[PDB]
Amino acid sequence: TVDQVEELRRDLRIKSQELEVKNAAANDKLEYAVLISEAQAIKADLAAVEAKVNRST
Numbered sequence: 001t002v003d004q005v006e007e008l009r010r011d012l013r014i015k016s017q018e019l020e021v022k023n024a025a026a027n028d029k030l031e032y033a034v035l036i037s038e039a040q041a042i043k044a045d046l047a048a049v050e051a052k053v054n055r056s057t
Contacts, residue, residue: 005057012049
């Protein structure tokens with residue numbers, strides 16, 4: 001379980017970095033609605049991931 005939670009933390013930080021990269025890409029592209037939708041989906045996934053990480057902690 002502890003190793004799995006470490007995996008969850010790695011996925012959390014990787015997806016946070018990906019969200020930041022896509023947000024910067026959307027800001028540069030301000031081909032914008034697709035990037036906005038992708039960033040919103042990644043942010044929702046990150047919120048769910050953070051909630052289940054909080055449950056694990």
